Design a protein around this motif. Structure first.
Motif, PDB file in Angstrom:
ATOM      1  N   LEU A 165      34.184   7.138 -39.015  1.00  0.00           N
ATOM      2  CA  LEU A 165      33.176   8.195 -39.249  1.00  0.00           C
ATOM      3  C   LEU A 165      33.772   9.331 -40.077  1.00  0.00           C
ATOM      4  O   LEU A 165      33.101   9.807 -41.005  1.00  0.00           O
ATOM      5  CB  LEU A 165      32.605   8.703 -37.926  1.00  0.00           C
ATOM      6  N   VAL A 166      34.982   9.760 -39.750  1.00  0.00           N
ATOM      7  CA  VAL A 166      35.618  10.850 -40.530  1.00  0.00           C
ATOM      8  C   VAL A 166      35.807  10.393 -41.962  1.00  0.00           C
ATOM      9  O   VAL A 166      35.545  11.197 -42.875  1.00  0.00           O
ATOM     10  CB  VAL A 166      36.907  11.312 -39.868  1.00  0.00           C
ATOM     11  N   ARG A 167      36.219   9.146 -42.156  1.00  0.00           N
ATOM     12  CA  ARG A 167      36.424   8.615 -43.507  1.00  0.00           C
ATOM     13  C   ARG A 167      35.105   8.699 -44.274  1.00  0.00           C
ATOM     14  O   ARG A 167      35.114   9.097 -45.455  1.00  0.00           O
ATOM     15  CB  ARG A 167      37.001   7.204 -43.476  1.00  0.00           C
ATOM     16  N   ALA A 168      33.999   8.313 -43.655  1.00  0.00           N
ATOM     17  CA  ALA A 168      32.666   8.349 -44.268  1.00  0.00           C
ATOM     18  C   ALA A 168      32.248   9.778 -44.602  1.00  0.00           C
ATOM     19  O   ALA A 168      31.578   9.972 -45.651  1.00  0.00           O
ATOM     20  CB  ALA A 168      31.677   7.680 -43.384  1.00  0.00           C
ATOM     21  N   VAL A 169      32.615  10.757 -43.765  1.00  0.00           N
ATOM     22  CA  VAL A 169      32.268  12.168 -44.066  1.00  0.00           C
ATOM     23  C   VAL A 169      32.902  12.520 -45.409  1.00  0.00           C
ATOM     24  O   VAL A 169      32.275  13.181 -46.233  1.00  0.00           O
ATOM     25  CB  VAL A 169      32.644  13.127 -42.920  1.00  0.00           C
ATOM     26  N   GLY A 170      34.164  12.166 -45.602  1.00  0.00           N
ATOM     27  CA  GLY A 170      34.826  12.288 -46.909  1.00  0.00           C
ATOM     28  C   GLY A 170      35.323  13.675 -47.214  1.00  0.00           C
ATOM     29  O   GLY A 170      35.509  13.960 -48.405  1.00  0.00           O
ATOM     30  N   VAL A 171      35.565  14.507 -46.216  1.00  0.00           N
ATOM     31  CA  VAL A 171      36.371  15.750 -46.397  1.00  0.00           C
ATOM     32  C   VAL A 171      37.833  15.300 -46.345  1.00  0.00           C
ATOM     33  O   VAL A 171      38.310  14.863 -45.282  1.00  0.00           O
ATOM     34  CB  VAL A 171      36.056  16.826 -45.371  1.00  0.00           C
ATOM     35  N   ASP A 172      38.497  15.365 -47.499  1.00  0.00           N
ATOM     36  CA  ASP A 172      39.837  14.757 -47.662  1.00  0.00           C
ATOM     37  C   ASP A 172      40.825  15.172 -46.543  1.00  0.00           C
ATOM     38  O   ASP A 172      41.514  14.310 -46.049  1.00  0.00           O
ATOM     39  CB  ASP A 172      40.378  15.103 -49.052  1.00  0.00           C
ATOM     40  N   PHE A 173      40.912  16.456 -46.198  1.00  0.00           N
ATOM     41  CA  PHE A 173      41.907  16.957 -45.233  1.00  0.00           C
ATOM     42  C   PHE A 173      41.697  16.203 -43.918  1.00  0.00           C
ATOM     43  O   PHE A 173      42.659  15.705 -43.325  1.00  0.00           O
ATOM     44  CB  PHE A 173      41.793  18.449 -44.965  1.00  0.00           C
ATOM     45  N   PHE A 174      40.442  16.060 -43.507  1.00  0.00           N
ATOM     46  CA  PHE A 174      40.170  15.415 -42.197  1.00  0.00           C
ATOM     47  C   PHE A 174      40.362  13.903 -42.291  1.00  0.00           C
ATOM     48  O   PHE A 174      40.777  13.303 -41.288  1.00  0.00           O
ATOM     49  CB  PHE A 174      38.780  15.750 -41.682  1.00  0.00           C
ATOM     50  N   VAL A 175      40.131  13.291 -43.456  1.00  0.00           N
ATOM     51  CA  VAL A 175      40.481  11.845 -43.609  1.00  0.00           C
ATOM     52  C   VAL A 175      41.987  11.656 -43.407  1.00  0.00           C
ATOM     53  O   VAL A 175      42.400  10.752 -42.673  1.00  0.00           O
ATOM     54  CB  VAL A 175      40.011  11.277 -44.951  1.00  0.00           C
ATOM     55  N   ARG A 176      42.797  12.507 -44.046  1.00  0.00           N
ATOM     56  CA  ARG A 176      44.275  12.399 -43.920  1.00  0.00           C
ATOM     57  C   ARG A 176      44.686  12.640 -42.472  1.00  0.00           C
ATOM     58  O   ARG A 176      45.568  11.918 -41.982  1.00  0.00           O
ATOM     59  CB  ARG A 176      44.940  13.358 -44.913  1.00  0.00           C
ATOM     60  N   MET A 177      44.048  13.602 -41.803  1.00  0.00           N
ATOM     61  CA  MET A 177      44.375  13.873 -40.388  1.00  0.00           C
ATOM     62  C   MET A 177      44.006  12.640 -39.552  1.00  0.00           C
ATOM     63  O   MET A 177      44.834  12.114 -38.780  1.00  0.00           O
ATOM     64  CB  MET A 177      43.634  15.114 -39.890  1.00  0.00           C
ATOM     65  N   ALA A 178      42.769  12.165 -39.671  1.00  0.00           N
ATOM     66  CA  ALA A 178      42.251  11.073 -38.819  1.00  0.00           C
ATOM     67  C   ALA A 178      43.045   9.783 -39.052  1.00  0.00           C
ATOM     68  O   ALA A 178      43.280   9.045 -38.103  1.00  0.00           O
ATOM     69  CB  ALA A 178      40.780  10.864 -39.115  1.00  0.00           C
TER      70      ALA A 178
END
Ligand SMILES: [Mg+2]
Ligand SMILES: [Mg+2]
Length: 302
Positions: free
Chosen positions: A40-53
């Motif tokens: 789900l975080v990957r789909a949101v696509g806010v880069d910082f949170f993709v790298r965190m998740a």
């Protein structure tokens, strides 16, 4: 105004807590692994949170204050996720067959918990966020594990009428959650939501939520200091998120008083006590930007 797509409607705070669930889920001995948080975080696509998740942002490589902040937040989300999961599993084990997730955001419980045959789970949120999560998980091939019904109405609008339209039955017991919501509400908006829950509940209904007992005028400058130091750490990684503008420091009726006055019994479980019970490091001082979070479960009396 400069974006139109479903993922751009998802709040940064919803994305942030999901990324923290993803991190928590990889811990050896994790209380819970929300296997849908990372995709789900990957789909949101806010880069910082993709790298965190994803773990591309490696806490072993971060400055000590950043690494510690992420690990303690992941542990806060482990205890919180465990708490609300076990609330629902206990409620259905006690014969409740109707559940409502308020401001359901990226909550994956309708896809990952075991729900007895005949359970209906209603999810209430603003339409773009509702549509985002449904379409994303359908495209990943994750079918719900229950009869799941969305109610695409912001909690600010007439969601009770829309919940009834979706087939909600106000004559049978309900298990309600409002996770990660009440500290962002005004005193008036909190009392209105608790009135709405109570009005749609029969005796034996259950509700779980949080009381942010330290967000008040006494502690305002200390907590604003924590939130400014956190905002700075986020800016170093390309995120602009100041929590200080999202919480209300003003007077309110403690939700537990409000519920007791409306005929609910309550039970309070402190972050401090849940971390100790689960053998996790304490979360206090600077690592607690909201202060001590109290988890509350309530049952409506006859
Ligand atoms: Mg420190
Ligand atoms: Mg008072």
């Amino acid at each position: 105004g400069d974006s139109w797509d479903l993922a751009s409607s998802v709040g940064l705070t919803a994305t942030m807590v999901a990324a923290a669930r993803a991190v928590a889920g990889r811990a050896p001995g994790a209380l819970v692994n929300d296997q849908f948080a990372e995709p789900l975080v990957r789909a949101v696509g806010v880069d910082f949170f993709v790298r965190m998740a994803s773990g591309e942002l490696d806490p072993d490589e971060l400055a000590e204050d950043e690494a510690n902040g992420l690990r303690r937040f992941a542990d806060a989300m482990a205890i919180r996720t465990h708490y609300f999961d076990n609330f629902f599993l206990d409620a259905t084990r006690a014969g409740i067959r109707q559940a409502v997730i308020l401001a359901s955001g990226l909550d994956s419980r309708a896809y990952r918990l075991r729900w007895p045959a005949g359970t209906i789970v209603f999810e209430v949120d603003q339409p773009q966020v509702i549509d985002f999560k449904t379409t994303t998980l359908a495209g990943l091939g994750a079918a719900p594990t229950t009869d799941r019904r969305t109610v695409a109405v912001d909690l600010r609008d007439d969601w009770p009428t829309a919940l009834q339209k979706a087939g909600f039955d106000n004559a049978q017991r309900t298990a309600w959650i409002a996770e990660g919501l009440l500290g962002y509400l005004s005193a008036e908006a909190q009392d209105r939501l608790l009135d709405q829950i109570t009005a749609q509940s029969v005796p034996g209904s259950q509700f779980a939520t949080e009381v942010l007992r330290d967000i008040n005028r006494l502690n305002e400058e200390e907590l604003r200091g924590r939130m400014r130091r956190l905002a700075e750490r986020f800016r170093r990684h390309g995120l602009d998120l100041d929590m200080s503008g999202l919480v209300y420091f003003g007077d309110r009726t403690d939700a537990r008083t409000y519920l007791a006055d409306h005929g609910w019994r309550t039970a309070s479980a402190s972050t401090t006590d849940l971390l100790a019970e689960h053998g996790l490091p304490p979360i206090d001082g600077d690592d607690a930007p909201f202060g001590e979070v109290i988890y509350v479960s309530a049952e409506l009396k006859a």
